[PDB]
Amino acid sequence: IVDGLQLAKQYGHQDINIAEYWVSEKLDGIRARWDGTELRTRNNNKIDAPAWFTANWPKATIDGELWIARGQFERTASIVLSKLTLPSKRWAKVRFMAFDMPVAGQSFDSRLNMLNNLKEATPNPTFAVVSQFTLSSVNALEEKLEQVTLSGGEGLMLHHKKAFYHSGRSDKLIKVKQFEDAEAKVLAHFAGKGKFKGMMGSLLVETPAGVQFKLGTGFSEKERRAPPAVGSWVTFKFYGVTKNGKPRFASFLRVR
DNA sequence: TTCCGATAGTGGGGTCGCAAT
DNA sequence: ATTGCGACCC
DNA sequence: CACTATCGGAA
Ligand SMILES: *P(=O)(O)OC[C@H]1O[C@@H](n2cnc3c(N)ncnc32)[C@H](O)[C@@H]1O
């Protein structure tokens, strides 16, 4: 019923009281909105799911994360986005981990309660609800994040209990993810496109372990002019690695 | 005063699907 | 059968 | 997804 989607703000952007938030593990899946009749992605591309996958689901609008287990994103994205054309029974171990309803004028605590009500009244086990728990100190958050990360999880999500749904980013829905640093030697330059015409678009870097990947973001516009010369070393941040061990969401930090 | 939230516009890894080879 | 490319997910 | 680079209004 609400127009735009409520996006999640990064943690560092100290001041919040965690006790006022529902905490839940961020599931590295595919976002999907349940139309009551149809599933659709973040940008409203139809998801071609089997009829049994949605059989007996509620007749309401629900936002959820199509998810199997931790560290199964690439495979999950292969099942969900592919057209369905009983072969293509790959949805067997997929679930719809609902986490919110886009209802206007009601606290997330109430929407969560409604979600749990809809699950008990739904015979299909594909319809699930993300587990919501409570933390106290910021230290408790840091330790839980570490544990989840080491256990293969992607991160944590914080949703304010007494907050109403509203599009955009705010402290009502916060996103928590870990990241590490690493070094790599630049092997080549790649010309940028669009506004970065005649400028550096990305760098073919390589890690000491022999993993090569293109580092294409994090540079200021001045850094793109006269970029790190080939043969030098650069430090980049990343959020884990892919199936092929390549850094994910990598961005440039500083040289040396 | 600073800082936040919203846009516009680049870039990656991975995958799917269609056009070109 | 191969390859390249745009458009999506993240 | 990550990011840089603006900009007007909220804090
Ligand atoms: P980006 O991932 O930066 O924005 C957040 C998205 O993550 C999805 N998501 C996955 N798992 C969860 C939970 N447990 N709670 C809330 N959101 C989650 C959302 O679909 C966002 O699009």
Numbering used by the authors: 7 to 19, 22 to 93, 120 to 290
Excerpt from the paper describing this PDB structure:
In step 2, the adenosine monophosphate (AMP) moiety is transferred to the 5′ phosphate of the nicked DNA activating it for attack by the 3′OH in step 3 forming a new phosphodiester bond that seals the break across the DNA backbone.
To further explore the mechanism of Lig E DNA ligases we have carried out site-directed mutagenesis of Psy-Lig and determined the structure of a close homolog from the marine gamma proteobacterium Alteromonas mediterranea Lig E (Ame-Lig) bound to nicked adenylated DNA. As with other DNA-ligase intermediates, the core catalytic domains of Ame-Lig are oriented to form a C-shaped clamp about the DNA with the nick positioned above the AMP-binding pocket. Inspection of the electron density reveals a phosphodiester bond between the 5′P of the nicked strand and the alpha phosphate of the AMP, indicating that the step two intermediate has been crystalized after transfer of the cofactor from the catalytic lysine K34 to the DNA. DNA encirclement by Ame-Lig encompasses ∼245° of the helix circumference, and the interaction buries 3837 Å2 of contact surface. Continuous electron density is observed for most the protein chain from I7 to R290 with the exception of residues 20–21, and a 26 residue section in the AD domain (S94–S119). The DNA-binding footprint of Ame-Lig is 8 nucleotides (nt29–nt36) on the nicked strand and 12 nucleotides on the complement (nt5–nt16), thus smaller than any previously-described DNA-bound ligase structure. The two terminal base pairs of the nick are distorted into an RNA-like A structure with the sugar moiety adopting a C3′ endo conformation and shortened distances between backbone phosphates, while the remainder of the duplex adopts the preferred DNA-B form.
